[PDB]
């Protein structure tokens, strides 16, 4: 409870710093504000969507780790309609609100008139081919639909586990949450793969990847697991984590952090070795733009500090059974996921490592601060760690 208020205050201060420097970035050049907001919303959306999906994975796979962080996963899932309200500046960014707000071109090349209109000045046929799928009405309808399913999934699971505190729970209400999470896991996988497509992979419409989204799956899950381990360390003295939680779920969550780190580097290496070995010139410009002009050193620092050190440090028992050093690892993971999503998103509009403005730090820290503040408000409104539950006995082993 009180450390939760401390981390909520820290997130609110981070959000205030972010909104101040983001408004300054609008004051200097609003296109830089909008592209930095694209990056900040993507790396802010790594938290609640992974929170939602991991809540549904643990409802499908009932574990002691899942009961340990069910309420924090439900708070992170509860922030989704506020993520819709934070999305809609982007929706203003690529719509007819262009030619206002100082934008020179719209935020996406399909939102551009000339690059998709027939008989226009540009008529780039790769982007003009996908004009039913990538048009402002279609993309806003798709993203709002995905928002509807995610908010329905998250709020229904949260309300059912809020009903779980009374009764009808040892066989009822958990079979209901099991069925809802079972259908929704497939729904969440396809909708957040398509969301990762429309938000990130459509920024350069010349390129595609079918492992994108699954790459975003692993990124969201590993950011989420490190976030969960980070604030699990803060609420150690909540008296109910001390009553029912031991270091065995801590070991389980550190184990899952290790597994998602290796799963993510497996996904990134899979995409890299597929595009690199089969040197076909529609897949290759993504990695040409990502090892040029200084981005190569970010790629090597990503390989050395977000895989090799996080893998090699997390082979051991202490740094998994112990919780403090697991929290330090998780903080390093969260920072390295920020750096990775910088490498994923910022080459599409920055073109240099030295072109990275202060807004590309303002928007991730600010929007993560908004995420953390709404999250820690959502943990406090309910009792954490659902005490009355048919999967309770795995905490007692």
């Amino acid at each position: 409870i009180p450390q939760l208020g401390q981390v909520q205050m820290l997130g609110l201060a981070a959000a205030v710093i972010g909104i101040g420097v983001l408004a300054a970035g609008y004051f200097l050049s609003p296109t830089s504000f909008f592209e930095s907001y694209i990056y900040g919303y993507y790396v802010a959306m790594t938290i609640p969507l992974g929170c939602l999906g991991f809540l549904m994975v643990q409802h499908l796979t009932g574990g002691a780790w899942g009961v340990t962080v069910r309420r924090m996963l439900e708070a992170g899932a509860a922030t989704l309609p506020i993520m819709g309200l934070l999305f809609i500046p982007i929706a203003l960014g690529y719509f007819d609100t262009y030619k206002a707000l100082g934008l020179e071109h719209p935020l996406y090349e399909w939102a551009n008139p000339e690059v998709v209109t027939p008989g226009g000045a540009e008529f780039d046929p790769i982007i003009a081919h996908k004009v039913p799928w990538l048009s402002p009405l279609w993309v806003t309808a798709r993203i709002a639909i995905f928002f509807i399913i995610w908010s329905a999934l998250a709020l229904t699971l949260r309300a059912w586990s809020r009903q779980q505190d009374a009764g009808g729970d040892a066989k009822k209400l958990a079979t209901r949450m099991r069925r809802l999470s079972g259908i929704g896991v497939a729904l969440f996988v396809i909708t957040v793969t398509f969301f990762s497509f429309d938000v990130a992979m459509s920024l350069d419409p010349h390129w595609f990847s079918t492992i994108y989204g699954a790459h975003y799956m692993a990124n969201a899950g590993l950011m989420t697991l490190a976030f969960l381990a980070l604030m699990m360390s803060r609420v150690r003295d909540a008296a109910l984590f001390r009553e029912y939680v031991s270091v065995k779920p801590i070991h389980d969550i550190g184990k899952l952090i290790f597994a998602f780190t290796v799963l993510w580097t497996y996904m990134s290496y899979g995409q890299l070795v597929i595009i690199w070995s089969g040197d076909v010139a529609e897949f290759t410009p993504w990695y040409v733009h990502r090892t040029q002009h200084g981005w190569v050193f970010v790629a090597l620092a990503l390989m050395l500090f977000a895989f090799a050190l996080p893998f090699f440090v997390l082979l051991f028992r202490g740094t998994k059974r112990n919780l403090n050093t697991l929290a330090t690892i998780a903080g390093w993971i969260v920072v390295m996921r920020f750096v990775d999503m910088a490498w994923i998103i910022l080459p599409e509009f920055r073109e240099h490592l030295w072109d990275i403005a202060i807004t590309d730090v303002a928007a991730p820290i600010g929007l993560i601060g908004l995420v953390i503040a709404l999250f820690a408000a959502n943990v406090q409104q309910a009792p954490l760690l659902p005490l009355r539950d048919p999967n309770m006995e795995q905490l007692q082993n």
Binding site: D279, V280, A281, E282, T284
Partner: protein, 144 residues
């Protein structure tokens, strides 16, 4: 060893596999017709045209022998030194072969033309066999 992966990945499908024993192993008259500067292939190995490399290797050895006989230590090979067989026998002269780094050669002057193009440029193969696009001369009465 015959993996035939090399077939599946070459985007022009020009490689050929000895699936069975295709080479005439028995008939002595057919054994007399084989040119002994090229290997006669056994069952289970790949096949594709080597830029007719028996002629390239022979002209290379000839250039190096004549260079060391003079003592120049240079090894300069003539433009007309290598004529591949499917170049030497084309009656229209469409196939042109030679060195491309040397700008004086016929093939490098042909590849400097604007209608020179490589087949399937989007796969970053950078072909050495390139094509000149068929430039037609139709009349004003049947097309215009």
């Amino acid at each position: 060893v015959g993996t035939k992966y090399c077939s599946n990945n070459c985007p022009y499908k020009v490689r050929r596999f000895n699936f069975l024993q295709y080479s005439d192993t028995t008939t002595e008259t057919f054994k007399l017709a084989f040119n002994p500067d090229v290997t006669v292939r056994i069952r289970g190995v790949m096949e594709k045209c080597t830029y007719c490399v028996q002629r390239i290797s022979g002209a290379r050895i000839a250039a190096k022998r004549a260079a060391v006989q003079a003592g120049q230590s240079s090894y300069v090979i003539s433009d007309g030194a290598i004529q591949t067989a499917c170049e030497q026998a084309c009656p229209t002269g469409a196939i042109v072969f030679g060195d491309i780094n040397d700008s004086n050669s016929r093939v490098a002057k042909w590849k400097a033309e604007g209608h020179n193009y490589g087949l399937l440029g989007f796969l970053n193969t950078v072909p050495r066999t390139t094509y000149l696009a068929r430039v037609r001369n139709p009349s004003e009465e049947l097309e215009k």
